[PDB]
Design a protein around this nucleic acid. Structure first.
Lengths: 119, 175
RNA sequence: CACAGGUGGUCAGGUAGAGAAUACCAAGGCGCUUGAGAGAACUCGGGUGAAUCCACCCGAGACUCAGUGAAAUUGAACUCGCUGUGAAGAUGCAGUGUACCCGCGGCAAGACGGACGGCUCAUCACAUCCUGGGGCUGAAGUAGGUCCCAAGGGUAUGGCUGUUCGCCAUUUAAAGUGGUACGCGAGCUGGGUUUAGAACGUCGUGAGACAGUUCGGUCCCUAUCUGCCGUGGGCGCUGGAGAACUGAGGGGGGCUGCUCCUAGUACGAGAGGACCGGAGUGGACGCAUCACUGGUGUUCGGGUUGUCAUGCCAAUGGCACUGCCCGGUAGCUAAAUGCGGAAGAGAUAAGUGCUGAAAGCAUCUAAGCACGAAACUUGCCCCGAGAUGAGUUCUCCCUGACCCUUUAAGGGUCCUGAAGGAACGUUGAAGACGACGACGUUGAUAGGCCGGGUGUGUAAGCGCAGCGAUGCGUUGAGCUAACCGGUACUAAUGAACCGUGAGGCUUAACCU
RNA sequence: GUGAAGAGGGAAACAACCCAGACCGCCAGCUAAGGUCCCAAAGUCAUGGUUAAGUGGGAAACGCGGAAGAU
RNA sequence: AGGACCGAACCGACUAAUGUUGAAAAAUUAGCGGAUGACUUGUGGCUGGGGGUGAAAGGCCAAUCAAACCGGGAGAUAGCU
RNA sequence: CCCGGCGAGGGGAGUGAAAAAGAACCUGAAACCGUGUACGUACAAGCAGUGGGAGCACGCUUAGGCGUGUGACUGCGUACC
């Protein structure tokens, strides 16, 4: 503990944290833009980027894994058809964080979106 | 006599011909070049300042850049001092290799303990206070192998601190 | 009090279920009154934009826990130690020493915090005891009494007496003796008294009390400063600033069993029997590490019972302690060890000594003049110039102008804004909060990706066999958070604030 | 006799020890106990003596010794 | 048929802890005990203060009992701060 | 009328003798909370006061040494019932 540790404390149940991560990842892949605190945005990016990278390759196993980790038929249907080819030539950095001004001393807020988000 | 400064990279085990496992620590010892010489007449005592590593010119402060340019040497990551044993005197810009420890077989290692949170009385003494960010000196350690071309030094047992820390190796005063 | 506490009857479904019990579901109700903010009027310095009328945001002063806000207490506090006196341990009396001002996290030498009694491992003496190790006592054994690093502050029966109790008897692992208000009645309790009800009667004008009666019974509060440890904001070391060290002072530990030969040598008639501490070998404790020897590792894989869902299977996700187990990445620990408590030196009590008397002897000393015990200090590991006596060394920068007065450690205005720091982001092996290391387009600081490593175990699909289960090649496959070397694919942009503009007075030495 | 019901000065401090009974004011001088190296105001004054142990600056009985005192 | 056994609701505070200006002027949590009997509960009524009640703790009688509240005796009281 | 949020609240103009009378409304001190004026305080030990005492800004005899606020230092100083 306190040495070479990844991930904030995030005091809460592990299952609740996983459900929250899945919900935020689904929201991001659906709307391609979210407003949330910097730690939450970073956690969402960390949890979603592996899914996007896996979705780059179209296969039955990849689709099944995405469905298992997302539990949304519509979301997986959207994936492997648009996001894949859109970011096929890009390795990493599929999401960007923009500072939307302010709390400053209570909790920061920022927008998390895709590299393009359109076109 | 004089000690060098190295960087910890890792620790592993070494097997001898007879088949004995001895813990060793990976320490990279860059050639320390003397930057300043302090004498009795001016500074009041005999000493030599040693610099190791390198830093980007952007982050190097102008006073430090001027001090390094005075000695005509590249700017390093820090400065260290060692007290001479009334022996031969070095000169500014004289690079020092790791050959000195190649014929001593006994060295002492000084490092910085890794930081840790507040510890209870039982944890510390078995008085509460700050743990880590403190000196750690280990003596009576014998160098296992010395590699001049690789600048790799091995010492029996472990050494203080974690990977990437800076340690100081000095001749074993005790004898 | 919209309280967390209490309120009588009826409606009583599905699955695994003997069960209205257990776990999830049908219809229905909820995600809880702390977890989380805008730009906060106004004021300053700025850059950006069509050339008066200005518009946008940053760096700041001005709110901050998105906050109302109570709590016993409080003569006034600028609330140090030791020694002596004192209606008796003096923060306040006399003498002496130390300490920069104001905060934060823990430990209480103790504040006589505040409103009799013993149950007390942390600093104390007797064997102290929230359950480590011991040494002695011609100890018959167990056991007492004597001693060490030490304070089980929850507990026997009893004489002197009042009971746990102040002296002690049997004590076992203690039933226990005071220091500190016997550390706390800011813990407990009465177990006898002045005090929960009886209770002989008392000293006692009376109050006040009877450590005297036989049984006794219900005892309150949310760290105020202070001492120690660590860590912060301001200021000063005299122009400012960044680094590296000397050093007045201060911090804690010097434990202990065996053997090899040295040497069965010396000494010693014989018996007897070392100095040798020359080298290795154990245990208690301290620093540090995870490659090795065990655990955790609710973030990783696999197996499995019930239940809901993905329209059904295969296969998955949610719940049943992480639903129950096999493990286990990095990290954190000990159940594992590299080292340590040196060697040596100074002065030492006792003791051992070169020449040597006073007082033709003697003698450790009178004259010249030397060692030495686990005692003391260096030597081993250190911090430390807030040491105001404010140190030493190296480096970087400012080389402007004008006006006025009460004409000097003077004041004011335009411009300049150096080195350095802070402001914000990535962040860490730094972290309660501060603070500290590295980077910010002149880049691997963080996220992801590439290939590898560890872990887990034969993922799904396909065709065959078994008319079920299930197996075969696909396949040492799939997945892998924290590990390794690169990748700018993404985030740290151009920037802006403080900080200056030649540095006071007197004197000695150099060309004027 | 003091305090009780009296200030002030000295004994380092102090209520009972010594001097001393304050009507008030004035930047004046002289005494008592106690001092005249400093702290702290006053002779480092003069003569005759004891003292080598800091006895002074804490001690009984007893043959200079007796003599061991409080973080 | 069990002052029978295990085990829900339910009942008792028997034990430990939570607090002693509390969430409550005696409550809460975790175990223990009964769980067809001397059981419990909804509602209505009676037993009244030198008295009632009391499977005898002199328990309880409106958060109080070795004799409760209200107005008068009483602006009471010997002694005392 | 303006700011403010199309509220509350505030600032102007007007009425009002007076708004130093605005519905919290005559006169308006203290304990307590903030800002400005001048001073002491970051090497300095105890009932925090009493005399001496250099300065810091201002008005005075327009210096000639006085007063409005402070004491770095120094002799003394164990609050009241």
């Amino acid at each position: 503990m306190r040495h070479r540790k990844s991930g904030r404390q995030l005091n809460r149940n592990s299952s609740h944290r996983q459900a929250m991560f899945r919900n935020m990842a689904g929201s991001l892949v659906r709307h391609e833009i979210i407003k949330t605190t910097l730690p939450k945005a970073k956690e969402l990016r960390r949890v979603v980027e592996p899914l996007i990278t896996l979705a780059k390759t179209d296969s039955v196993a990849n689709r099944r894994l995405a469905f298992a980790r997302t539990r949304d038929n519509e979301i997986v249907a959207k994936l492997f058809n648009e996001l894949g080819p859109r970011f096929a030539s890009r390795a990493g950095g599929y999401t960007r964080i923009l500072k939307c001004g302010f709390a400053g001393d209570n909790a920061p807020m920022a927008y998390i979106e895709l590299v393009d988000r359109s076109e | 006599m004089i000690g060098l400064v190295g960087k910890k990279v890792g620790m592993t085990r070494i097997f001898t011909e007879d088949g004995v496992s001895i813990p060793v620590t990976v320490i990279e010892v860059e050639a320390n070049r003397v930057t300043q010489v302090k004498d009795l007449a001016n500074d009041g005592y005999r000493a030599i300042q040693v610099t190791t590593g390198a830093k980007k010119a952007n982050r190097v402060t102008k006073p430090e850049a001027g001090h390094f340019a005075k000695a005509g040497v590249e700017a390093g990551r820090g400065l260290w001092e060692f007290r001479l044993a009334e022996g031969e005197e070095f000169t500014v810009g004289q690079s020092i290799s790791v050959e000195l420890f190649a014929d001593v077989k006994k060295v002492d290692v000084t490092g910085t303990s890794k930081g840790k949170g507040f510890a209870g009385t039982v944890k510390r003494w078995n008085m509460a206070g700050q743990m880590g960010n403190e000196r750690v000196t280990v003596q009576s350690l014998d160098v296992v192998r010395v590699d001049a071309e690789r600048n790799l030094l091995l010492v029996k047992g472990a050494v203080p601190g974690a990977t990437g820390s800076d340690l100081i190796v000095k001749p074993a005063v005790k004898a």
